[PDB]
Amino acid sequence: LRCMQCKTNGDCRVEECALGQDLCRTTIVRLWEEGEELELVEKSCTCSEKTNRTLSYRTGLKITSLTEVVCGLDLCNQGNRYLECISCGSSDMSCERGRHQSLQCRSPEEQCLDVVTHWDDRHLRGCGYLPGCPGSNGFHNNDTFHFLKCCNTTKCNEGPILELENLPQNGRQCYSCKGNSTHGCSSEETFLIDCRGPMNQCLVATGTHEPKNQSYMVRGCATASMCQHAHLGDAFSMCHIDVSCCTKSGCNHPDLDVQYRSG
Numbered sequence: 001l002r003c004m005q006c007k008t009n010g011d012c013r014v015e016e017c018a019l020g021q022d023l024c025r026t027t028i029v030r031l032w033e034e035g036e037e038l039e040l041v042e043k044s045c046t047c048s049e050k051t052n053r054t055l056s057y058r059t060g061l062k063i064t065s066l067t068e069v070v071c072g073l074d075l076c077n078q079g080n081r082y083l084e085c086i087s088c089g090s091s092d093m094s095c096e097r098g099r100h101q102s103l104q105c106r107s108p109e110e111q112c113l114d115v116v117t118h119w120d121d122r123h124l125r126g127c128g129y130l131p132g133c134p135g136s137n138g139f140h141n142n143d144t145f146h147f148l149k150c151c152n153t154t155k156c157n158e159g160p161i162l163e164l165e166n167l168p169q170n171g172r173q174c175y176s177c178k179g180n181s182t183h184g185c186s187s188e189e190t191f192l193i194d195c196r197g198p199m200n201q202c203l204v205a206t207g208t209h210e211p212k213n214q215s216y217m218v219r220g221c222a223t224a225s226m227c228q229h230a231h232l233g234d235a236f237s238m239c240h241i242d243v244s245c246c247t248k249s250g251c252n253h254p255d256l257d258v259q260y261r262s263g
């Protein structure tokens with residue numbers, strides 16, 4: 001496959017994609033601040049199980065806009081008001097402190113977003129889009145929580161900030177670990193936890209951490225929607241992923257692993 005490869009300095013060239021890099025991408029950071037817009041664009045060959053997603057949120061007077069689009073054809077990365085949502089961010093701690101400024105979405109297909117991440121919670125609330133929406137998806141284990149919600153109606157993302165400790169136990173229990181089979185996901189590190197909220201599937205996923213080529217694995221609790229290559233790709237920076245989810249407590253046990261015609 002081939003794609004444009006561009007550094008943020010605006011210099012680009014055609015890149016012959018490495019074996020198993022099967023996507024092209026454009027990553028875009030846009031910052032509007034009291035009159036000025038700044039923009040940084042990267043392009044490159046990427047590894048699949050990624051989707052298109054965008055997000056805009058307020059920090060003080062600034063607006064920050066994050067975007068990735070991906071595509072499959074040679075050089076397909078070449079060239080490139082509405083619903084009212086709540087918005088806030090974490091850098092200024094505005095999500096957490098409760099100062100939630102209002103934000104009109106610039107595009108008809110954007111919806112209200114809420115996205116929580118931690119391994120120091122990071123909270124971003126604003127306008128954006130993903131293929132799922134409206135919907136939500138989520139994963140948590142002993143030290144990890146990722147959550148995403150999209151709503152189709154006005155200021156629907158208003159509310160206290162979603163924290164794991166306020167979702168009641170599901171009744172489902174699943175094995176918990178992250179790392180590889182020797183480090184972080186050894187048997188001594190893999191143990192049962194109580195699932196919470198709508199995260200009522202046991203999950204295991206393996207793929208290749210993208211930044212460095214190492215094997216990665218994760219186990220825990222998930223929404224059914226989390227059991228999806230792109231979402232796991234996004235959340236853990238992974239690719240060429242095998243996922244399984246199952247709805248019997250402990251069915252996440254590493255001794256119950258089975259490859260899925262990856263194959």
Ligand SMILES: *[C@@H]1O[C@H](CO)[C@@H](O[C@@H]2O[C@H](CO)[C@@H](O)[C@H](O)[C@H]2NC(C)=O)[C@H](O)[C@H]1NC(C)=O
Nearest residue numbers: 050051052068069070071072073076079080131
């Ligand atoms: C992300 O959305 C882009 C935007 O269209 C998708 O790329 C489009 O592909 C269709 C089919 O070739 C074309 O009509 C458009 O020309 C493409 N858009 C542009 C601007 O080139 C792309 O497929 C999406 N990524 C995924 C995986 O959904």
Ligand SMILES: *[C@@H]1O[C@H](CO)[C@@H](O)[C@H](O)[C@H]1NC(C)=O
Nearest residue numbers: 179180181182183184214215
């Ligand atoms: C597994 O985990 C750590 C690094 O993540 C490392 O010490 C070990 O060698 C890894 N195994 C492989 C195959 O990368």
